[PDB]
Subunit: 359 residues, 4 copies
């Protein structure tokens, strides 16, 4: 019984935004995606797309215009936006344009605050956008901290973690697929191969972790630092032991046939792959960086460690890989604490009450 | 046994390009998508994406660079590109950059020739791109005509029609879904609501076709001319009889629960929806514009008619809607001639032999 | 004694905006140009530039941010913007961001209303921007009409015509330059060679006007329709009689050594070249399209005529070219009515009082 | 007696490219600027502009297309391009498109190699572009070194330094202007306020250099690091001693009324301001970074020093500021060695012989 409008980019935000809309739809709400791109068929989910046509094509203004148009045409109640720039400001304009007859909900996520908020040319813009939203939420407490530190908004930010569709991530085992990939221990890592992900360390740790255990490394994803990483596995003589799989999308099957997940980036606010992973009963070893610690509880559902500690990571890995007792327990502990505090139906309900509350 | 690289935009070209790659993959070939965007999981389909970072971000050059890099790194045999600008020229640069150790296959499609070729600032560029490709194909003979008329290239262009994944389009019936949409005759129309699609005529014809038959019009899609069309159904008192469904993606289910498809645009080189439609046993009434006539054979699998003939279209419709004999036959004739000359496995084989031939 | 901030694109708007700032500066005001681009040296004119760094680079938002920053940092009084999209909306955001402690003055001009206002994806956006500005002005009454017709804003729009720097346009004669160009009657035409300018008609009329008078045609400017026009002068055997000069900037000298100016576009809201021209004592023959009629008074300072009337234009030209009495009078009448109602110091004072008034 | 086509961005390259074209024109050559933007009036200098109209607007391809079109239409001899990406590759395409009936001259400059060449996504592209040009030159030997280090092209690169229009930079003195700015020693610094320019050090050094000498600092330019620098002069209590002048263009007058120029960036390949400066009889103190050392000969025409040596710079400054003997000599020595090896008419002749030679 609610008309919601979602806006996002079909990276991490898109996955969540889209899934949140799909869920909300199944609960009888009428969802209206307002986004230029490409997010079965639901009778209660409509897709509006921003068409553009001057120095730079006004996508921002165009998006604001469409939000406003869809808003008053479909008589939307809530307008839920997902990255901060530009969406937050666009929703503000839209609101002002339709006489403020709508409620804005802004969800923050990693880079919009982490990296964008750092840029002085957009600081005041991000602040204004946050302060002007009716309700603001973040994906992790670490983020709400980073926000008050860099942007310094005079607004309250709630915490609502991201979720995963369990109907897509289960402990199924692709034993027939391992054959199709040519293998037998499996170590999987998913990222956008950027410097911040520190993919080099995932390799270094594997170079070591491999001398004492026979296992292959699945490198899902593609990005700038690809060649460097390729050059690395190359003059490290682990070349035939790493499967660059390039960027995949349906990574659910890959995690399923995995044993250990690695995430050793310099920063991160959240981020699902951990969930996806854990969700599939796969224990993780992520760096202790703001936001990983809120999902991985050391020793119970995975392990943490300082950035750059290639050696320490390997050690922690080699140990967990042989002990099959600890590995069956951790992997179970993990997919449990996930169902526990990251249950999709649970989180969706938090957003649901936030909407009702803002009215 | 072939390493192919596909490039496209995940409009019409993307659908085909992507599907062609999926098919080729299932046949054991190793497909390498080289495109910045987002096109189950196949072990033999890799996705490489173009990352950019100056006046305008050099996407073209960047794409050329990545084609070249992937080409010689993975040792590709063929590089199959799909729209002409820029892809054709990018593949040329890529080729020149890797010492010409690769074969370029360019597939033309609607607008790249239709509208772009019209622009003098890109004429010579499109020509050069075509002439430099090793093999060039078009989606319809009408296109090969338009090409030799506007661009005037000194190269031979073959004809290879587009196809549809029958594994997605069948005569299934969503009788339970009609209920979910609130209905009972069904008339469906899919487009990007641009002036060229002449959506106004689809409405005019429906305004008439409705006075003599009770049916609702499904308007799938969203674009610039949306408001105008909305204003039209509005002061035409057919407002409660048209279901703007906004732009959908999984339109397979909608066509399934349809009876008649309309396409009355000023121009078109192909275009699938006809196929999709027909494929689902849905007879079509499209304008006699270069390229529709090669799929719709009047009276046997659908009907044609001059552009702007709102009245003639309605008449042709009202007639076919009641005669249930003619409608069961046409709908059968249609999904047959589709399996006939547009069989996915058939077309894929043509492209397959074209690759082998170019070597 | 006023701190003004100007924003524009260094086409027509830029020329005016920039000149207006230069003038205002000489009057002791402190001008602050807020624009990313490149508009002697004045101690009271500062240049702030928008730096950008995501789907599309947020130039709009960035500009809004900089307006806000400069505004409260330099404590600006007025923020004068010149095209409507995006500047109008950017100034709105800026205002809202600095607590509304600033006055927004929006000046409309041709295409922002003429062509942009036509696009439904930006209609409501242009309206909102206009309505939100504190003062709004247009360059011609024709524009204020077009505005209320297409955009339909609930705001009052004043009329303030554009001006020309007489310190740059005088009746000087470049008799030594005609030699440098290889000539002796001179017909000059300046445009962006777009279809709307109807450069073809300027040629057709010249093809005729030439059979009865020996004169060359100066085609200043460059654009899409260039080749077509080049092809035209070509198979019209006037090839050696037309001087494509390509796009020039310091056109003051060219107009100086001219005799008749032609402007036969389908539409135009203003536009200076007429002024520049007239200002140089050069009589003009422009089509009777909304906004030309407010500068050219037929027979007294030039002639008007229907669009497409190539023949009528030629006739009117050939006649005025020989009668040397009428030509000395008109050319004098013209540069007078220009000093009269378009005096730079006069118009600048209107804008000046508008600023003071808005406080 | 030569038809040359120049391509550039109206930063440093634009200044040089444009001036080079102006000079070449005065020598009787027919210059054809092929560039989308805005670079008196010369009868032998034509301006062609690239018009664009899809994912990203194909400016590169469009530029290539226009180069080709202008090339064979005007029958150009040489095509001289100035930054490497994209212009080098565009000229390659253009050449290939007109049957190679043209000679390409590529001039390298700072960032195209320095920063772009660093990016692996454009490495091979820059190399290919260089190797494919018929003649390649750089602005400094330091650059030719950086080039062979990062890009590693198999091509020969000549050295041709940048020049300055002496007809714009002379030892004139704006004593009347100092009054208009409110001053009396004058220290001037020009940059784009980027981190690489290390504007902070220019301030630190001034904070010190000021305690022992009364002088104001002219900070010409605007960029990202502006606020930080503004915050610095702020909590350094030198606030009323620094004249942020924002970004100026006609900086000739400012240098004229200056005494010492500072340039303490981490890197630089050339760069004129030194020339401009010196040219005006203003001694400079620049960091010893690859390319500054080829213009500043320590002690004879200026001083060099390690980066970050705020103290050492101040010391060197305070010393030269009082000794009025050394300051009159250095300032004279400087504007001499400039006329010496950077004489505009001299450099232009080098480029001129390079063109003739390539034929």
């Amino acid at each position: 019984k609610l008309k919601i409008g979602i806006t996002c980019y079909p990276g991490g935000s898109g996955v969540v935004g889209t899934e949140l809309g799909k869920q909300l739809a199944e609960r009888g709400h009428e969802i209206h995606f307002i986004t230029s791109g490409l997010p079965k068929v639901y009778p209660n989910i409509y897709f509006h797309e921003v068409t553009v046509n001057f120095q730079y094509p006004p996508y921002d203004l165009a998006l604001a215009s469409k939000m406003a148009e869809v808003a008053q045409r479909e008589n939307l109640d809530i307008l839920h936006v997902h990255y901060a720039i530009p969406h937050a400001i666009c929703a503000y304009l839209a609101k002002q344009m339709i006489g403020e007859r709508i409620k804005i909900v802004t969800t923050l996520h990693g880079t919009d605050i982490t990296v964008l908020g750092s840029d002085p040319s957009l600081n005041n813009l991000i602040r204004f956008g946050i302060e002007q939203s009716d309700v603001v939420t973040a994906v992790s407490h670490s983020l709400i901290n980073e926000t008050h530190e860099l942007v310094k908004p005079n607004k309250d930010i709630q915490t609502v973690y991201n979720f995963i569709d369990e109907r897509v991530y289960f402990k199924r085992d692709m034993t027939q697929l391992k054959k199709e990939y040519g293998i037998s221990k499996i170590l999987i890592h998913i990222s956008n191969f950027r410097k911040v992900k520190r993919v080099q360390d995932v390799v270094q740790a594997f170079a070591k972790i491999v001398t004492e255990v026979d296992a292959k490394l699945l490198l899902v994803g593609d990005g700038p630092e690809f060649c460097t990483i390729l050059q690395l596995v190359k003059n490290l003589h682990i070349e035939d032991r790493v499967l660059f799989l390039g960027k995949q999308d349906n990574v659910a099957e890959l995690l399923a046939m995995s044993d250990l997940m690695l995430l050793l980036s310099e920063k991160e606010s959240f981020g699902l792959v951990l969930l996806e992973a854990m969700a599939c009963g796969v224990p993780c070893i992520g760096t202790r960086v703001g936001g990983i610690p809120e999902v991985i509880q050391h020793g119970d559902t995975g392990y943490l460690c300082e950035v750059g500690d290639t050696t320490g990571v390997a050690d922690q890995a080699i140990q967990l890989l042989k002990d099959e007792e600890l590995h069956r327990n951790m992997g179970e502990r993990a997919r449990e604490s996930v169902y526990e505090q990251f249950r999709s139906e649970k989180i969706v309900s938090q957003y649901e009450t936030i909407y009702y509350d803002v009215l």
